């Protein structure tokens with residue numbers, strides 16, 4: 005067999021064939037060693053590690069693939085791992101990847117297809133046969149408060165009324181032989197659905213957690229598609245094909261038929277347990293910072309022969325928390341702005357900002373037709389984005405004109421640094437939901453869950469009126485075309501590299 | 502031969518021997534072509550171009566050296582051109598370069614030595630023999646308002662009372678056969694001295710402009726050493742050697758004996774002329790933005806046989822306006838903070854900020870002993886720096902703790918983005934002098950000369966009280982030493998690059 009974007013096992017074979025995989029066949033410790041290798045890969049844009057020989061693997065549970073959505077070293081196929089999630093050429097641009105992820109937003113869903121069985125049913129362990137403390141669950145960072153089984157699997161929960169089935173990534177660690185704890189926080193759809201079940205008050209939330217799902221499905225899992233939209237049908241429209249799902253053995257939820265590993269059970273509407281600390285997307289761990297988290301009960305495990313667990317070793321640049329959380333939030337913000345009649349062409353979360361900023365490219369011809377001002381426009385953009393779930397993780401919005409490529413962090417930083425006057429050209433937002441994981445929020449001087457957001461206007465004054473009134477002092481813009489070409493043509497003949 | 506740091510001709514020979522020079526012996530047009538080559542060099546960190554065959558060179562005036570203080574491609578000798586200005590090993594760090602530049606601040610000056618002649622007297626042209634419009638003065642950017650003869654020479658002016666002789670770089674372009682116009686703006690020492698002569702009211706300011714001066718002298722020329730300090734004696738203390746100067750033929754100022762090209766004349770206390778626009782340090786030109794500038798009268802030219810004019814093709818990253826203006830301002834800010842009993846260890850202007858920010862590394866053990874708060878400390882740091890001339894060009898100060906290397910822009914951006922809460926952790930400064938060259942100032946929404954400055958506190962709350970309370974989620978900090986070394990030792994054996 006099945007295509008790489010629809011089958012995780014086929015995706016691993018695609019990374020091998022690409023020479024974008026290192027298969028490590030010698031024993032590797034899930035206590036820190038796997039994650040240390042993976043962390044070094046992410047910090048150096050090396051090949052994805054596949055740990056085929058994990059110390060503690062029992063009865064086919066489990067191998068690990070690290071860095072499944074991290075960057076490649078070359079600029080030509082920098083985003084090729086992400087392209088392999090989506091059936092795009094490995095040379096795809098970030099604009100092409102985000103346009104692919106947005107393509108289903110104005111298509112009819114393609115609902116999933118139920119099939120009677122699949123590879124995820126090759127093996128099973130009941131409530132008397134598994135112990136989550138006896139599996140080779142990784143310790144990802146030396147001060148983590150638990151072994152984080154869940155960094156790149158898909159939580160599956162459904163609204164009490166059955167009308168909305170949500171797929172999302174949210175971290176979880178092993179609590180004991182048959183429980184996890186994890187983050188379930190507003191405004192995330194796992195939390196929205198949990199609240200629906202708690203207000204109904206009758207039972208715990210039927211749940212499954214599927215690891216090594218179809219790559220196109222883990223991308224949508226990481227994307228803030230709208231409230232009430234079933235990710236399975238959005239992935240179906242995006243890929244042009246209905247995803248094959250099989251029913252859980254112990255509940256009526258459906259999981260991707262080729263899922264490497266499936267946990268079945270319940271998310272409690274009443275119990276909590278110690279969760280964290282964890283080395284998180286902004287690059288930090290606060291040792292001993294244990295909080296209470298959601299508590300999951302595991303009733304059954306099913307899995308593929310020779311099952312592979314994907315793992316994100318997240319932290320400092322560059323991993324899946326940057327390449328997928330940032331970029332997919334920026335894509336949904338682009339679309340949200342356009343649907344609110346704001347003249348935004350492109351959005352990207354600069355890696356240099358630890359994906360806490362989103363740069364918004366403005367169609368300044370349209371802006372001019374609005375006959376508005378910086379203060380009015382900044383206000384309007386912030387109100388749209390910072391009061392919506394798609395803006396949750398983003399604390400700074402940078403507005404830039406048509407000359408800036410928002411996918412080039414150097415050009416965003418240049419525009420921000422030179423065209424936005426601190427204070428005057430900015431609007432602060434203190435009455436919007438804040439992202440507490442950002443250290444200046446949850447470990448900062450102010451309310452952990454509120455405010456700390458800013459719109460920074462890097463549009464220049466004439467971009468609102470008559471048009472750009474500068475040329476860059478760069479090779480591209482400060483020299484005529486014929487001269488530039490002469491210089492490029494004579495470069496090596498003159499003696500340069 | 503004489504040493505490279507004391508003689509420009511020896512510095513050019515040192516870049517050749519380093520394989521850090523390309524000698525272009527075929528004809529090159531000073532109308533845009535030289536500067537286009539130079540701009541491409543600066544944008545790619547290539548070798549410095551020496552144009553030995555400039556279209557329009559007459560009677561030894563002149564060759565051009567581009568990119569004299571720009572970066573090299575390698576990380577190992579990135580700052581080697583700057584090190585060659587100062588007799589430092591080409592592998593010198595930015596900390597070592599800035600410590601060299603600061604070393605004279607607590608030494609007695611070594612006053613200069615007068616010698617009866619030198620190479621700068623090999624040739625001369627009087628008021629009837631030269632025409633500045635007939636020399637091969639470069640057009641640096643296609644929309645410049647003039648041919649900018651002066652980007653990397655040294656203006657020499659003296660206080661009416663003779664007690665202070667200032668050396669500085671300030672741009673100037675050709676106005677007519679025997680005049681320049683240029684920028685003379687507060688709070689710059691050329692402007693401070695001009696004001697002393699205008700209030701005396703008796704005559705125009707005796708002036709000289711020396712090109713291809715001793716490299717150690719052009720570095721101090723670019724540095725905001727204190728008011729009333731004669732740069733010649735500071736360079737003498739920094740180098741351990743008294744600089745040799747010769748008297749001007751038409752006035753009583755003294756110029757470096759090995760100066761490649763010397764203009765002698767007067768800076769008018771009454772006349773102005775059209776100056777600019779110019780492709781400037783932040784990366785911009787505003788075409789047709791002509792202002793009035795200072796007007797210089799040229800009475801005489803003296804020059805070396807086969808004279809070389811240094812040229813900065815300034816604009817977008819990376820050139821002398823970044824590597825010298827930013828870094829030398831940051832060095833003087835470091836020292837100014839320490840002299841005000843602020844616990845600052847290091848300062849650097851991140852290139853990513855277009856050198857509009859300075860990152861200040863804090864000794865947080867000392868900070869803890871201060872028993873202060875973010876708001877109080879931010880206020881104190883901003884008042885010291887933004888009310889001093891050394892802070893003029895800098896619009897944002899970022900305070901960072903002991904774990905950040907301020908010389909690594911990636912680490913500054915990470916700290917800024919994750920540890921400074923927008924608004925709450927910042928103090929805006931609207932009643933301080935602003936730098937109008939920054940587009941958001943002079944071409945922005947607010948007063949061109951006032952405010953727009955900010956102190957951004959990227960210290961975390963516990964850094965003021967009990968100590969850092971996090972570990973980075975990175976390879977260095979989230980894995981024990983023995984594991985890290987094992988991973989590095991096995992890296993290639995496992996299959997990585």
Ligand SMILES: Cc1cc2nc3c(=O)[nH]c(=O)nc-3n(C[C@H](O)[C@H](O)[C@H](O)COP(=O)(O)O)c2cc1C
Nearest residue numbers: 172173174175187192193225226227228316324328
């Ligand atoms: C590696 C990785 C780790 C993630 N960890 C979390 C987490 O612990 N909690 C969370 O709410 N979101 C986490 N996310 C982000 C969510 O997947 C993202 O916000 C998504 O929009 C959630 O789906 P929803 O829109 O259906 O709620 C993570 C994403 C990735 C790629």
Ligand SMILES: Cc1cc2nc3c(=O)[nH]c(=O)nc-3n(C[C@H](O)[C@H](O)[C@H](O)COP(=O)(O)O)c2cc1C
Nearest residue numbers: 669670671672684689690722723724725813821825
């Ligand atoms: C390539 C280059 C161009 C410069 N252009 C100017 C300019 O046009 N005007 C100016 O006031 N300073 C300019 N400077 C900066 C000053 O040299 C710097 O602010 C220095 O501190 C001035 O000397 P002073 O402290 O003796 O006034 C330039 C520096 C460099 C390296």
Ligand SMILES: O=C(O)c1cc2ccccc2s1
Nearest residue numbers: 175282283284285318325441
């Ligand atoms: O542990 C982590 O890195 C993260 C936790 C969360 C919570 C919400 C959205 C993104 C993330 S990323």
Ligand SMILES: O=C(O)c1cc2ccccc2s1
Nearest residue numbers: 672779780781782815822938
């Ligand atoms: O033309 C330019 O790039 C510059 C003008 C000025 C004025 C003052 C300080 C630095 C600079 S840099």
Ligand SMILES: [K+]
Nearest residue numbers: 171224225227
């Ligand atoms: K989702």
Ligand SMILES: [K+]
Nearest residue numbers: 423429461463
């Ligand atoms: K602006």
Ligand SMILES: [K+]
Nearest residue numbers: 668721722724
């Ligand atoms: K100076």
Ligand SMILES: [K+]
Nearest residue numbers: 920926958960
């Ligand atoms: K702070």
Ligand SMILES: [Mn+2]
Nearest residue numbers: 170171193229
């Ligand atoms: Mn959802």
Ligand SMILES: [Mn+2]
Nearest residue numbers: 667668690726
């Ligand atoms: Mn001075």
